[PDB]
């Protein structure tokens, strides 16, 4: 069955790597925003999350939809967990200078996201009109984040998310997360947990974000340090993740008229994939020749998650992305059946 999956992956590789002026239109827009933000008092320390993440694609079937993250370092940050949610936090300050750069967004001890987002939108709003280069128009749809969405000409779309960066130890609710010890090693888990973490808005609560960790794992993904560095140990982890992402997008596109799959997104698929990486830590369990079987492990596991309504966040295991209060039974049963139909029909959404 690996023949059809290879073709899907090769078509997908060709649209990725095909010459496109898109990422260059995005970089120029972003560079201007960053310069204008930087000469403002609240945003002096603003920058891009990854330098080279102008062409950062969440949607693997839409090469004109980009997603970028602007970060702002918050020293001496004081976090308070909201309502035992494990993942949502009030942000207050230890306060070294009474007025650090973010003072103008406080309400009491607590940092206001809505007010910080409003000034961020407005500054960006005042630089879009200033643009003489290309056709740029922004759209404000609710949710909190992705905060600002810019449309460059007819096809190019960019989501801009503002995130706070903290360089201190990850919050206690991550303690039992990142369960990579038996796969990538305990040492690697330590090195990654020494990296910063982020907070995005989503009640003026912020949500922990570990965006930046996926690139770190995906580029160094084997139990063997030489995974995918020769022909004797080529594995299919990356391809399985891409095929899972493309499955959800195609299903979401096929059923955009109904509402049942609106709660699901690629991070649900990413999460479930990395849980299978923990379950199956050996490179031999990810042999390239076994693409078809391995993809089926991933599908099977994700379907198990839907039916039991349990999908643990990868960093904060007590958080169930599939709880009833987050996604109702109807939605999960609808997705379960659509995937079964794909699985038992040699995945028709791939040849279309
Ligand atoms: C986009 N959204 C909206 C809401 C949340 C959310 C909800 C609850 C929690 Cl408890 C958290 C905690 N924060 C969080 N959880 C993730 N999960 C992954 C996917 C898995 C992964 C990623 C990289 C390496 C290995 C596995 C990507 C990511 O950036 N985060 N960030 C995040 N997320
Ligand atoms: Zn590999």
UniProtKB/Swiss-Prot annotation:
**This protein's GO CC annotations:** cytoplasm; cytosol; nuclear body; nucleoplasm; nucleus; plasma membrane; site of double-strand break
Q: Residue ranges for motif Nuclear localization signal?
A: 135-145
Q: How is the cofactor bound?
A: Binds 1 Mg(2+) ion per subunit. Is also active with Mn(2+). Mn(2+)-activated enzyme forms an inverted pppGp(2'-5')A intermediate, suggesting a non-canonical but accelerated 2',3'-cGAMP cyclization without substrate flip-over. Mn(2+) ions are coordinated by triphosphate moiety of the inverted substrate, independent of the catalytic triad residues.
Could you tell me the EC number(s) of this protein?
Answer: 2.7.7.86
- Record site feature (Arginine-anchor), residues: 95
Provide the effect of residue 225 to R.
No effect on stimulation of interferon production
Which superkingdom, per the lineage? Eukaryota
- What happens after mutating residue 53 to D? Phospho-mimetic mutant; decreased nucleotidyltransferase activity
Documented effect of changing residue 215 to R: No effect on stimulation of interferon production. Strongly decreased ubiquitination by RNF185
Q: What is the effect of changing residue 227 to A?
A: Abolishes DNA binding and enzyme activity
Q: Where does this protein hold GTP?
A: 51, 159, 207-214
UniProt site (Important for preferential detection of curved long DNA): 27, 35
Stretches for region DNA-binding = 13-55, 215-238
How does it associate, per the subunit comment? Monomer in the absence of DNA. Homodimer in presence of dsDNA: forms a 2:2 dimer with two enzymes binding to two DNA molecules. Interacts with nucleosomes; interaction is mainly mediated via histones H2A and H2B and inactivates the nucleotidyltransferase activity by blocking DNA-binding and subsequent activation. Interacts with PQBP1 (via WW domain). Interacts with TRIM14; this interaction recruits USP14, leading to deubiquitinate and stabilize CGAS and promote type I interferon production. Interacts with ZCCHC3; promoting sensing of dsDNA by CGAS. (Microbial infection) Interacts with herpes virus 8/HHV-8 protein ORF52; this interaction inhibits cGAS enzymatic activity by preventing the formation of liquid-like droplets by CGAS.
Q: What name has this protein been given in UniProt? A: Cyclic GMP-AMP synthase
Which lineage is the organism of this entry classified under, starting from the top rank? Answer: Eukaryota, Metazoa, Chordata, Craniata, Vertebrata
Q: Which gene encodes it?
A: CGAS
Q: Which residues of the full protein are shown?
A: 161 to 521 of 522
